[PDB]
Amino acid sequence: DLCFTNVYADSFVIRGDEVRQIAPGQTGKIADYNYKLPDDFTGCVIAWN
Amino acid sequence: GAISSVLNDILSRLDPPEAEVQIDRLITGRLQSLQTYVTQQLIRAAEI
Amino acid sequence: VFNATRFASVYAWNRKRISNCVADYSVLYNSASFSTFKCYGVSPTKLN
């Protein structure tokens, strides 16, 4: 039901236990040094084996 | 209901995502306290 | 504590007191050896 000016699809691969780091305000190797989400992130995270 | 009554203590102990919640608790509390004071003062000034 | 050869049972959990020293917490939160590093009422980085 919604429109947006832009959408960004950020694609990458991690291990299973690190999927939890892809969320707002998370800590660890991934969230710190690889890919950081903002605390006010508005979007979707999709992950599959 | 915050972890401390001091604001710097929260800032020096937590990261922004959680310090936000704690500071929201303090802000709510103190703002409520100020409104109380101002209302009392309005009424008292009316009496004066 | 971390490099202890043998650990105690949960019912008889060991307690070590740490005092009068400099705690380099980086050695812990920068280590890749831990599955769970969960800090309550404090942020690990701030510990320094």
Q: Measured between alpha carbons, how far is C15 from C30 in angstroms, rounded to an integer? A: 24
Q: Do B13 and C41 touch (CB under 8 A)?
A: yes
Is the Cα dihedral B31, B36, B40, B42 positive or negative?
Answer: positive
Resolution in angstroms for this experimental structure?
Answer: 3.6
Q: Which residue of C has its CA nearest to A32?
A: C30
Candidates B29, B30, B2, B28; CA nearest to B14 is B2
Q: Measured between alpha carbons, how far is B25 from B13 in angstroms, rounded to an integer? A: 16
Token couple for A15 = 């291990």
Q: Please state how this structure was obtained.
A: cryo-EM
Token couple for A34 = 């690889």
Contact residues, chain B to chain C, C-beta under 8 Å: 3, 12-15, 18
**Which of B28-33's residues contact partners 24+ apart within 8 Å by CB, and which partners?**
B29/B1, B29/B2
Residues of chain A with C-beta less than 8 angstroms from the C-beta of C32: 29
Candidates A15, A23, A17, A21; CA nearest to A42 is A23
Are A36 and A8 within 8 A, CB to CB?
Answer: no
Which of A39, A40, A41 best probes binding to B when mutated, by most B CB atoms within 10 angstroms? A39
